[PDB]
Design a protein around this ligand. Structure first.
Ligand SMILES: O=C1N=C(NCc2cccs2)S/C1=C\c1ccc2ncccc2c1
Ligand SMILES: O=C1N=C(NCc2cccs2)S/C1=C\c1ccc2ncccc2c1
Lengths: 341, 341
């Protein structure tokens, strides 16, 4: 057990349980699989379902998380409605229910997340062939969403789970099968619905989000680019928590922000004389410059297949959303020629 | 640098800085002293003030934390107004200012918190003489607040700082001087002001708070009891994050909740047939019973001075706020006879 640290702790709002407890006279809690701001996920044995091992996501007993979970539920319903055979690469929901205020969602039991595998492997990056397969699947998965007028908005390695994270050793861990699925549709959004102003986890937030110019499907593609990169080098592309620094970092890695965007943003405070307001010759300046570099310098190799990866990444991190690569285009990219046939 | 984990991370809203930076052409940031939900505290050299080392509390650039900080500021102003010579045992604020949205407060540089000293010492508890001195000062400090129509509402070991945490070794750490001060008046509340429904950090939350019956000065005294205990055994008295469990724990440790309170609470969901709704013969039941016991069983010793401590604690954890020990009574308690003369 852990120490609460404030009047409003993540520790609050959870459902108490102990291994061996049953829910709805049906799910036997076997073990806890993880915790997130939303709640906990627990491994259960489903007894109205053969003994099948499932992943139960138990949501906090709080209005905001419960709202998000009701929204997540019908996003999952509309997913099963458009892909009965689970060929779409989004996680399969079995059932859901309110449990004394805690929304509960049952999913097929998967493996470790692509983040947690990495972390548990000392942030040693995935080999390129594995990055290719993973990236490919991630694009299919999210294109499916995009086709049905959805935007996930919170794509990140923790929300991409290996179907099975069994691995081999060498002193280094290597996953046996890079089959993956996309999870967490709590923030997912249809085109007709209200859009939150701020929408992604910092490291995967797209510039149009930062500058509140509006967002839609393209901001996912930005997230995807940032993930592919992370998979390839093993650390986040934008390690920052401040808007101005984040923008400073983009500029350095990607080149300058288009004035159209600078001019149109209500977030005018980060700009002076028409450019980003950021002195490179301060300590903050020194920090960004010392801690990141132009995108193409992160290449491990000179081989073509590596350069092809970075062309893909480079297109996904296009500043201007309308010019940014779509995921349809993404699946046609040279980098993926092997995996298509 | 650390990984953001959600759309709304603690990592967000902070002010970027680097050691060596100056603020207001005055404070030279020397080192970071810690982080909390509110912001960061940094050690600075004040150059409009002799070179004095101060603790600068830099608040996030966010409406809720900034509101709390404006409130914290005038609570500190009214404290200097009623005790010019800093004899009151609350921390001394030197100055404050808005810095591009970040409220900044300057304090005398103190030492490690009573929690962090403990933690850094493997949760080995403070000897009783030290507990006595600490408890005594904590009571004076908060009585001062109580006298001037205040309630801190967030008393906890992290908010009680040693003036100087220099220590001697033996394999065990022992602080050389148990002089302490009370910090963090972000949640502090006058009697005429609006009272938040929920007000303390879980482990120090008073039953009248949990059951939303109203609260005022007495709920601090509850917190204080819980702290004294923690100081004496080295771990929290109520290790829980759920209301019903928490109430279950109280009952076991303290005896049964007064029906008056059960009956009057709008939080009627935790009660059936007039008592707490809690089956002791479930696993949850088994957990509470196995993980805590009646208050007086935590005694390390049989000596009178130990029993005296527990009479004090026992009175501070009176269920009924009006019957609960006041801090005036507290300072007169037998346990403190040594320290008075
Ligand atoms: O719908 C979901 N949202 C998630 N959030 C990812 C997390 C982030 C931080 C802690 S968990 S997990 C999830 C469902 C989910 C589905 C199947 C699983 N199988 C094995 C292990 C975990 C699993 C989690
Ligand atoms: O007004 C305040 N509220 C605080 N909150 C306590 C924390 C809790 C978690 C991280 S910091 S510290 C504080 C002021 C404060 C004042 C003097 C100090 N001297 C040395 C070291 C730290 C210091 C912090």
């Amino acid at each position: 057990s852990r120490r609460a640290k404030s009047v409003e702790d993540d520790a609050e709002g959870h459902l108490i349980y102990h291994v061996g407890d049953w829910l709805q006279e049906r799910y036997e809690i076997v073990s806890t699989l993880g915790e997130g701001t939303f709640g906990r996920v627990v491994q259960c044995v489903d007894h109205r379902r053969g003994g099948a091992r499932v992943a139960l996501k138990i949501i906090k007993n709080v209005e905001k998380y419960k709202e998000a979970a009701r929204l997540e539920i019908n996003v999952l319903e509309k997913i099963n409605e458009k892909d009965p055979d689970n060929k779409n690469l989004c996680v399969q929901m079995f059932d859901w229910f309110d449990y004394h205020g805690h929304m509960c969602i049952s999913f097929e039991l998967l493996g470790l997340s692509t983040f947690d595998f990495l972390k548990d492997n000392n942030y040693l990056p995935y080999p390129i062939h594995q990055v290719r397969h993973m990236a490919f699947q991630l694009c299919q998965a999210v294109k499916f969403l995009h086709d049905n007028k959805l935007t996930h908005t919170d794509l990140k390695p923790e929300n991409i789970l290996f179907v099975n994270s069994d691995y081999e050793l060498t002193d280094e861990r290597s996953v046996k099968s890079t089959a993956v699925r996309v999870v967490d549709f709590g923030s997912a959004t249809f085109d007709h619905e209200h859009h939150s102003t701020i929408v992604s986890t910092r490291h995967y937030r797209a510039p149009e989000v930062i500058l509140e110019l509006g967002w839609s499907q393209p901001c996912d593609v930005w997230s995807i680019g940032c993930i592919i990169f992370e998979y390839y080098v093993g650390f986040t592309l934008f390690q920052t928590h401040d808007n101005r620094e984040h923008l400073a970092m983009m500029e350095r890695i990607l080149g300058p922000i288009p004035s159209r965007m600078i001019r149109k943003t209500r977030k005018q405070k980060y700009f002076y004389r028409g450019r980003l307001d950021w002195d490179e010759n301060t300590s903050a300046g020194r920090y960004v410059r010392e801690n990141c570099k132009p995108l193409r310098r992160y290449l491990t190799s000179e081989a073509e297949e590596h350069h092809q990866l970075f062309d893909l990444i480079e297109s996904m991190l296009e500043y201007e959303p309308a010019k940014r690569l779509t995921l349809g285009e993404a699946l046609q990219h040279p980098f993926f020629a092997r995996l298509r046939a």
